[PDB]
């Protein structure tokens, strides 16, 4: 299960980056 657990960690990081990208997008619009 090591590989499955790392694959899951990777998916969580992809999602974290998605949401930070969205925050960056909202704030550029603001400035």
């Amino acid at each position: 299960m090591k590989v499955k657990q790392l694959e899951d960690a990777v998916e969580e990081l992809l999602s974290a980056n998605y949401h930070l990208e969205n925050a960056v997008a909202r704030l550029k619009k603001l400035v």
Binding site: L6, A9, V10, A16, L20, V24
Partner: protein, 32 residues
């Protein structure tokens, strides 16, 4: 190595995380 490839992928994505977080911080200070 599957494991090494995924560990390197974690590091790649964390590097991008750090930049995005720095950008939110930079931009928040200009909006506010």
């Amino acid at each position: 190595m599957k494991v090494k490839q995924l560990a390197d992928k974690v590091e790649e994505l964390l590097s991008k995380n750090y930049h995005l977080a720095n950008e939110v911080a930079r931009l928040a200070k200009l909006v506010g």
